[PDB]
Design a protein around this ligand. Structure first.
Ligand SMILES: COC(=O)N[C@H](C(=O)Nc1ccccc1CC[C@@H]1CN[C@H](COC(=O)NCc2ccccc2)CO1)C(c1ccccc1)c1ccccc1
Ligand SMILES: [Cl-]
Ligand SMILES: [Cl-]
Ligand SMILES: [Cl-]
Lengths: 99, 99
């Protein structure tokens, strides 16, 4: 699809068999989701946002569907104002910016 | 142009006669630039994101040339870690997400 930016680019994602709403964020290098359960082991990661740095849990090779496109990659879990799909997964779904 | 997401979507902007580098951020509702002087009246605002909030100055009706395209709108100025072009100006240049 072609998504305009008059409103927030919120889409449905599917992870762990559940639907969630998430923001397509070209300013984010990584994908960060609000508190949830994911399988396997996690590693520590510090991420910097507009307000400062936060600790998150890094899970690798996680299956996630974004706006109907399947991806398998790194998902960070932590305190975020909204679920964000960052460039690591936007590249997997073939997303570009155009003007 | 078609801007890839393999790297951060950084472009050249021109504002107040100054050339700067800025991030095209579909996850940002607003445009926020690192500390600089702008003409006219301003009012304070708090903007939130990962890590919390930052206090910024809000200037309205500001002219910005983004990657050669003129856009007018509100520009926030404060302690952001990177210059961000948010949706309020991305819409003006006809920027869309495509996949
Ligand atoms: C009242 O309205 C808001 O509070 N709006 C928020 C917003 O637009 N706020 C905002 C406005 C102007 C400039 C910068 C920012 C802050 C948001 C931008 C988003 N992209 C980059 C995200 O990049 C980072 O956080 N840095 C690195 C990183 C790496 C991996 C994963 C995430 C982030 C930089 O921050 C918004 C939002 C909040 C609640 C519900 C829906 C949306 C939001 C918050 C946090 C993340 C994404 C969006
Ligand atoms: Cl990844
Ligand atoms: Cl505006
Ligand atoms: Cl349009």
């Amino acid at each position: 699809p072609q998504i305009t930016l008059w409103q927030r680019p919120l889409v449905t994602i599917k992870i762990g068999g559940q639907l969630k709403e998430a923001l397509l964020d070209t300013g984010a290098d990584d994908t960060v989701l609000e508190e949830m359960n994911l399988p396997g082991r996690w590693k520590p990661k510090m991420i910097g946002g507009i307000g400062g740095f936060i600790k998150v849990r890094q899970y690798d090779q996680i299956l996630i569907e974004i706006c109907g496109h399947k991806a398998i990659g790194t998902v960070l879990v932590g305190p975020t104002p909204v679920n964000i799909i960052g460039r690591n997964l936007l590249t997997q779904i073939g997303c570009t910016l155009n003007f």
